[PDB]
């Protein structure tokens, strides 16, 4: 019936402050497939965000990768914001470079 | 190479 | 080693918002290589891997025509399914299909696959014999009856034992520098104090391909399955995958823990420790 998304926020490469990288938001395990995902920088929507083609796992739940180019720092906060029919409020998950 | 699927459910 | 090719179809109805959307993606192993989306401005089957781009226009015309025919068949099937479940025509529903073939190191068919789900529930599946169906409920028995009379199982067997494996073999040769290259994980252990009493040991595997990997923590040589946090394997965006496994350990006991990594790209399985 309905499954709520799992959410991981992480970088493509190990984060080094000042060095260009890619910020990923991987949403998986959800059903049905309509989902809204925003990448945020200091709380503001990043405009140039790409995503993968919709596919699904062996248990039929969907997954998508949203990604954008970014340059990490010590002060800048990054996050993924996700809405889905299963969520009463959008869920925000902050990027932790150690996870 | 895909299968042509012409039989409805 | 062994290889698979799979097509994944998703059809979503959306009453009041046009006709049902149809999406199809094709994979060899963990590498996507084509996509179709009926919502694209000019829907056509499109390349998503460099090694499929050498296929000529006859290839892309054929795949596009199949996807357009499948779009119409899936729209009719969604209407049928709504009727079999006595469902309102105001609700959204999903029909999913995934099919394809697995081959061994010698290219011979290991097995074929064709299964379907409706609103995320298994609905009907072609059995491993490629000759009979397992139907989940009385609605899927109606579909089974239709397909038994349309000789569907016979057509799937001919495709899965013939075209499916021949094209997979062709893709594997055309993409051999990537499809047939296993990239081992780059591995290391990080240490994250929690309190005076406990710290997290986190074992990382990065940059590996394909996605299949085993990552386990042992304490004094005994697997810590109940006490290990294991995140889902996740794509890096550059073909490769990432995963980590974490255990909470008593302060000062870190050296009793070992991380064990198995992956196809490794000459031998790895054992790692926190190395302060």
Numbering used by the authors:
A (entry chain B): 1 to 99
B (entry chain C): 1 to 9
C (entry chain A): 1 to 276
Give sentences from the paper.
We tested for association of five HLA loci with disease course and identified a strong association between HLA-B*15:01 and asymptomatic infection, observed in two independent cohorts. The crystal structure of HLA-B*15:01–peptide complexes demonstrates that the peptides NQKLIANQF and NQKLIANAF (from OC43-CoV and HKU1-CoV) share a similar ability to be stabilized and presented by HLA-B*15:01. We crystallized each peptide in a complex with HLA-B*15:01 and solved their structures at high resolution.
The HLA-B*15:01-restricted peptide NQK-Q8 is conserved among all SARS-CoV-2 variants, even the new XBB variant of Omicron, and differs by only one amino acid from the HKU1-CoV/OC43-CoV peptide. We refolded the HLA-B*15:01 molecule in the presence of each peptide and performed a thermal melt assay using differential scanning fluorimetry (DSF). Both pHLA complexes exhibited the same thermal melting point (Tm), indicating that the Gln>Ala amino acid change does not affect the overall stability of the pHLA. Overall, NQK-Q8 adopted a canonical conformation within the antigen-binding cleft of the HLA-B*15:01 molecule. The Gln at position 2 (P2) was deeply inserted into the B pocket of HLA-B*15:01, whereas the P9-Phe primary anchor residue bound to the F pocket. The central part was more mobile than the rest of the peptide. The NQK-Q8 peptide exposed to the solvent, and potentially to circulating T cells, five of its nine residues (P1-Asn, P4-Leu, P6-Ala, P5-Asn and P8-Gln). The superposition of the two pHLA structures revealed very little difference between the two complexes, with a root mean squared deviation of 0.08 Å for the Cα atoms of the antigen-binding cleft (residues 1–180) and 0.12 Å for the peptides. Only some local rearrangement around the P8 of the peptide was observed with a shift of the Glu76 side chain to avoid steric clashes with the P8-Gln. This change, which is on the surface of the peptide, could affect T cell interaction and might change the TCR affinity.
